[PDB]
Ligand binder design. Structure first.
Ligand code: CLA
Ligand code: CLA
Ligand code: CLA
Ligand code: CLA
Ligand code: CLA
Ligand SMILES: CCCCCCCCCCCCCCCCCC(=O)OC[C@H](CO[C@@H]1O[C@H](CO)[C@H](O)[C@H](O)[C@H]1O)OC(=O)CCCCCCCCCCCCCCCCC
Ligand SMILES: CCCCCCCCCCCCCCCCCC(=O)OC[C@H](CO[C@@H]1O[C@H](CO)[C@H](O)[C@H](O)[C@H]1O)OC(=O)CCCCCCCCCCCCCCCCC
Ligand SMILES: CCCCCCCCCCCCCCCCCC(=O)OC[C@H](CO[C@@H]1O[C@H](CO)[C@H](O)[C@H](O)[C@H]1O)OC(=O)CCCCCCCCCCCCCCCCC
Ligand SMILES: CCCCCCCCCCCCCCCCCC(=O)OC[C@H](CO[C@@H]1O[C@H](CO)[C@H](O)[C@H](O)[C@H]1O)OC(=O)CCCCCCCCCCCCCCCCC
Ligand SMILES: CCCCCCCCCCCCCCCC(=O)OC[C@H](COP(=O)(O)OC[C@@H](O)CO)OC(=O)CCCCCCCCCCCCCCC
Ligand SMILES: CC1=C(/C=C/C(C)=C/C=C/C(C)=C/C=C/C=C(C)/C=C/C=C(C)/C=C/C2=C(C)CCCC2(C)C)C(C)(C)CCC1
Lengths: 30, 35, 48, 38, 245, 52, 42, 49, 42, 30
């Protein structure tokens, strides 16, 4: 049952990495 | 098993030939100085 | 009717058929907050 | 990306609605906890 | 077979031929001498079945369920020898030496892995008749040794003739008068020897090569893991070959 | 059989067919740009910027 | 003995919808502070 | 200044983002169905049907 | 068997500090939207 | 152990009532 928590934490970490890459704040000049 | 081997061999020779003929596709000239 | 005893007739009944004739398999016997499988209530069935 | 969306609106929740929703969630938690714990 | 002896080691290796029995050609008869001896008895299983309660259509009969081998091509016994004793009426075979055991793991439907020592160790096999015939039937009991020896350590470092005799990661269980008596069956590693039963059946005899060969069917029990789990009955079928001298 | 000494792991002629057909397919696309290219056109740089 | 999943159901069923409303109220006040134009807008 | 119960009306006259908001409900429903079945396979006992 | 209080320690130890940062980011963007002055300020 | 949850929910409900009364948004004219 704790493997449900382990899977959710790892898949939840990869979803943060997805949004950090493709929904990043674009660096803009001026 | 041996149907999977056809699929992987088809997949590997697809991407390797893209790598080969892509670097044969006048690849030094693809630089921002000229061409 | 075909010349079997009471003990031989009842031994021909499949346990899957006897399991349906038990009130713990009634869907109108549970509770709103009795959570989980039906095995969580009475146990896992083993033998008739 | 296409243009900036003209349908973009602001969302409000005033302090009264915060207190009403905090009360609702705590009271529903008070009510339903005894049943969930069984 | 004469065909296999024609090949090099380099032609056979990797191919899987080395796990196969030789096929015998012909229907003849061999009458064993008083000093006769089977020499290179190959025994190759080709089917594996483990007994398990299954839920077919409405009931729960016991069925030998076909299982898949996961220890790849290491299962065939070979070079089994032993004298062929001629009794008054019947012909008997007592195996002595050779690779007469092979550790095999099969997997049941559900993911259950069933390791077992497929063996013919200490086989005394009684036949019907006095000559090897294409209808000859040899069979007898053998001894299945335990799958793990007493030198085998478990994941916690416990074994039969070596190791800890306590669950050493739970030192507070050695407290009070009862101690670790609830963990006795896991701390007591027991070497168990069970019995199996093989029924061979010759159907092809080559008299010029003095070679017999046929089918078998064998049943035995699986690994008990030093007396920690209840063993399952494993039914196996396949082909054998032998040379008679 | 994996420890046997086969050329590129080709133990069936299916695998030889898909190796040819896979490599000739990207070759045929690549010949759409570099076929009909003159053989006697040289250059004296470290790098050529000929055409497309 | 009570059901152990109910500790998760009650406490996440309280905190996550409560922190959603605290989130909505705080961004409402921050949006009013940004539009007000002084010392809290930045 | 939308109230909390009217926040999703911003895609009422935006057919591109109505499709996007329905694709996300579809992603969540199919993701529920895949993960509920994986949870159910982890706890199912297929030994005595 | 695992410790049952660890389900609370992990899930509230994840969600409550994560929703605090989601709260801080959202009010930062709402304060910028209010100061921007158009259609999102109100 | 669940009486810890029962106490926290009731005391937490009364703390919301405290803030709803003494930290209320004051009704203002004009
Ligand atoms: C191994 C398999 C194989 C494959 C995949 C090909 C592929 C090709 N050969 Mg062929 N060829 C082969 C073996 C093969 N060859 C063999 C064994 C022989 C006998 C020796 C030949 C003899 C031969 C000759 C003589 C010629 C070709 C030609 C061609 C090319 C077609 C020209 C073109 O690009 O127009 C397009 C081709 C189409 C079929 C139309 C496709 C239209 C799609 C929709 C793309 C259009 C763009 C679209 C708007 C957007 C792109 C999306 C899309 C890519 C998904 C193509 C790359 C021609 C060539 O290479 O010219 C130099 C040509 O003259 N072949
Ligand atoms: C159509 C919806 C639906 C239905 C009929 C089922 C049916 C089932 N589920 Mg499934 N499930 C569903 C959707 C559904 N599920 C969804 C959407 C999820 C993801 C959250 C799950 C995740 C899930 C898990 C992990 C498990 C089940 C299990 C089960 C089985 C046992 C039911 C039980 O014991 O409930 C218990 C009774 C309740 C939950 C009461 C329902 C809620 C009441 C009505 C109160 C309403 C909420 C309240 C107002 C808010 C709380 C206030 C808050 C402030 C605290 C049953 C077959 C169990 C099972 O046996 O699997 C093998 C099981 O372990 N489900
Ligand atoms: C420079 C990068 C590069 C690399 C790494 C490759 C790599 C490969 N190519 Mg090549 N290819 C390239 C560029 C490249 N290509 C270019 C620029 C062209 C011209 C357009 C080709 C045209 C080409 C063809 C037509 C074929 C390949 C094939 C291959 C594969 C050969 C397999 C092998 O090694 O067996 C080793 C092979 C042998 C030991 C046998 C060859 C020796 C024979 C017996 C000698 C006879 C000479 C000749 C074949 C016949 C004479 C006639 C000829 C002079 C006109 C290998 C993946 C082939 C393949 O096998 O696909 C799987 C294939 O058919 N390529
Ligand atoms: C099917 C799911 C779904 C979809 C596709 C949408 C879609 C939308 N929401 Mg809505 N919303 C939803 C459910 C959904 N919502 C739920 C369940 C809530 C209550 C928490 C809300 C509360 C909400 C607010 C307050 C706002 C939106 C807004 C929007 C719009 C822009 C996206 C945004 O910035 O949201 C921000 C909102 C969210 C990201 C909701 C969080 C989604 C869940 C709770 C994340 C939980 C993940 C976690 C692992 C699960 C728990 C275990 C977009 C139309 C915004 C809008 O444009 O209003 C004008 C907006 O301000 N939604
Ligand atoms: C497919 C069905 C469907 C769809 C697409 C809509 C769509 C809409 N409804 Mg309607 N409605 C529906 C069914 C539906 N409704 C049902 C079943 C009811 C009875 C409960 C209503 C009663 C209703 C009212 C009274 C109102 C709407 C409103 C709206 C609009 C804005 C919703 C919003 O922003 O809330 C945002 C929601 C949140 C910020 C969080 C809500 C959290 C809920 C209460 C619990 C969490 C939900 C849970 C995660 C999902 C469970 C899945 C389950 C539905 C299967 C939007 C057009 C509003 C409107 O008319 O706008 C002008 C409005 O005032 N609906
Ligand atoms: C965001 C907030 C997140 C929290 C939301 C709170 C939801 C609270 C309600 C659900 C939790 C209540 C479960 C009690 C805890 C419990 O013991 O769970 C434990 C039980 C399961 O119980 C476990 O089951 C296991 C097998 O998987 C083993 O058998 C374990 O031994 C057994 O304990 O969990 C569930 O049953 C969860 C079911 C949730 C699905 C809801 C089904 C009902 C759907 C009907 C919806 C109708 C709604 C119409 C509107 C009315
Ligand atoms: C981990 C548990 C954390 C749970 C998070 C609770 C919410 C904290 C977020 C606070 C926030 O975003 O800070 C930023 C917010 C908003 O920030 C405030 O904005 C004001 C104008 O809007 C002024 O500018 C203030 O200077 C500025 O601090 O600050 C708060 O602390 C909000 C206070 C009112 C709400 C308190 C309820 C939270 C308690 C639950
Ligand atoms: C906001 C986020 C909220 C979550 C924060 C997460 C905190 C996580 C860490 C604490 C939880 C870990 C406990 C595991 C769960 C568990 O089994 O609890 C269960 C245990 C208790 O265990 C129970 O005890 C009961 C008696 O009360 C009975 O004996 C029960 O049978 C027994 O299970 O709970 C605790 O021990 C909680 C202690 C927390 C206090 C911290 C003490 C250490 C302080 C040192 C701080 C040093 C820090 C320096 C920096 C480094
Ligand atoms: C119960 C579980 C709920 C957990 C709460 C998650 C946070 C939801 C709060 C959203 C919020 O306050 O709404 C209000 C916020 C802010 O509101 C948005 O503000 C924008 C300018 O700041 C524009 O004005 C948009 O129109 C307006 O919707 O809307 C969001 O949904 C923020 C989206 C970006 C953050 C998403 C991460 C949240 C997922 C976790
Ligand atoms: C996985 C994701 C799960 C998502 C779930 C999280 C979202 C759930 C939270 C939303 C609920 C919010 C309700 C806010 C509450 C709130 O915002 O109210 C204020 C709101 C009126 O809003 P107005 O139109 O005044 O708009 C002001 C705006 O700022 C509101 O955004 O009323 C309603 O929303 C409708 C009436 C609800 C009335 C609420 C009363 C509840 C009764 C309380 C019962 C307790 C006492 C009982 C004792 C017996
Ligand atoms: C975030 C993340 C991730 C991800 C990663 C990534 C980011 C990925 C990407 C991916 C990608 C990036 C993809 C792509 C795709 C693409 C495609 C799929 C394409 C296709 C193409 C083709 C198919 C082509 C064709 C052709 C033509 C057109 C002409 C000439 C010839 C040829 C045939 C070649 C992961 C998982 C790690 C997890 C963590 C986080």
């Amino acid at each position: 049952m704790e493997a449900l928590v382990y899977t959710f934490l790892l898949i939840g970490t990869l979803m943060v990495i997805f949004f950090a890459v493709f929904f990043r704040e674009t660096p803009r000049i001026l | 098993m041996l149907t999977l081997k056809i699929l992987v061999y088809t997949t590997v020779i697809f991407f390797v030939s893209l790598f080969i003929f892509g670097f044969l596709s006048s690849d030094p000239s693809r630089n921002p100085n000229r061409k | 009717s075909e010349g079997l005893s009471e003990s031989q007739a009842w031994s021909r009944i499949p346990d899957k058929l006897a399991f349906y004739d038990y009130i713990g398999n009634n869907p109108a016997k549970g509770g709103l907050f009795r959570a989980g499988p039906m095995n969580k209530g009475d146990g896992i069935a083993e033998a008739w | 990306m296409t243009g900036p969306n003209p349908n973009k609106q602001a969302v409000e929740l005033n302090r009264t609605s915060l207190y009403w929703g905090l009360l609702l969630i705590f009271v529903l938690a008070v009510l339903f906890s005894s049943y969930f714990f069984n | 077979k004469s065909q296999i002896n024609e090949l090099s080691y380099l032609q056979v290796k990797g191919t899987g031929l080395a796990n196969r029995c030789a096929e015998v050609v012909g229907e003849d008869s061999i009458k064993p001498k008083p000093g006769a001896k089977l020499v290179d008895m190959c025994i190759e299983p080709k089917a594996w079945a483990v007994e398990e309660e299954v839920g077919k259509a409405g009931k729960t009969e016991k069925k030998f369920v076909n299982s898949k081998v996961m220890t790849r091509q290491t299962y065939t016994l070979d070079a089994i020898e032993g004298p062929i004793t001629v009794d008054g009426g019947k012909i008997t075979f007592n195996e002595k030496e050779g690779i007469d055991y092979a550790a095999t793991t099969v997997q049941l439907p559900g993911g259950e892995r069933v390791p077992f020592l497929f063996t013919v160790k200490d086989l005394v096999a009684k036949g019907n008749g006095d000559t090897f015939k294409p209808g000859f039937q040899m069979g007898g009991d053998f001894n299945t040794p335990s799958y793990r020896t007493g030198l085998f350590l478990d994941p916690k470092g416990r074994g039969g003739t070596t190791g800890y005799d306590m669950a050493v990661a739970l030192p507070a269980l050695q407290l009070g008068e009862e101690g670790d008596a609830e963990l006795f069956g896991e701390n007591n590693k027991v070497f168990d020897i069970t019995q199996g039963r093989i029924e061979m059946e010759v159907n092809k005899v080559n008299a010029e090569d003095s070679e017999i060969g046929g089918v078998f069917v064998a049943t035995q029990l699986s690994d008990t893991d030093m007396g920690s789990k209840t063993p399952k009955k494993v039914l196996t079928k396949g082909i054998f070959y032998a040379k008679v001298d | 059989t994996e420890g046997t000494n086969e050329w590129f792991g080709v133990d069936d002629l299916r695998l030889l067919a898909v190796l040819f057909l896979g490599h000739w397919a990207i070759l045929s696309l690549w010949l759409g740009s570099y076929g009909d290219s003159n053989e006697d056109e040289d250059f004296f740089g470290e790098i050529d910027y000929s055409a497309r | 003995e009570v059901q152990f999943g109910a500790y998760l159901a009650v406490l996440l069923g309280t905190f996550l919808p409560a922190l959603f409303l605290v989130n909505l109220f705080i961004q409402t006040e921050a949006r009013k502070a940004g539009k007000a134009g002084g010392q809290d807008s930045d | 200044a939308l109230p909390w119960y009217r926040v999703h009306t911003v895609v009422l006259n935006d057919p591109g983002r109505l499709i996007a908001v329905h694709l996300m409900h579809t992603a969540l429903v199919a993701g529920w169905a895949g993960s509920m079945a994986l949870y159910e396979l982890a706890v199912f006992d297929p030994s005595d049907p």
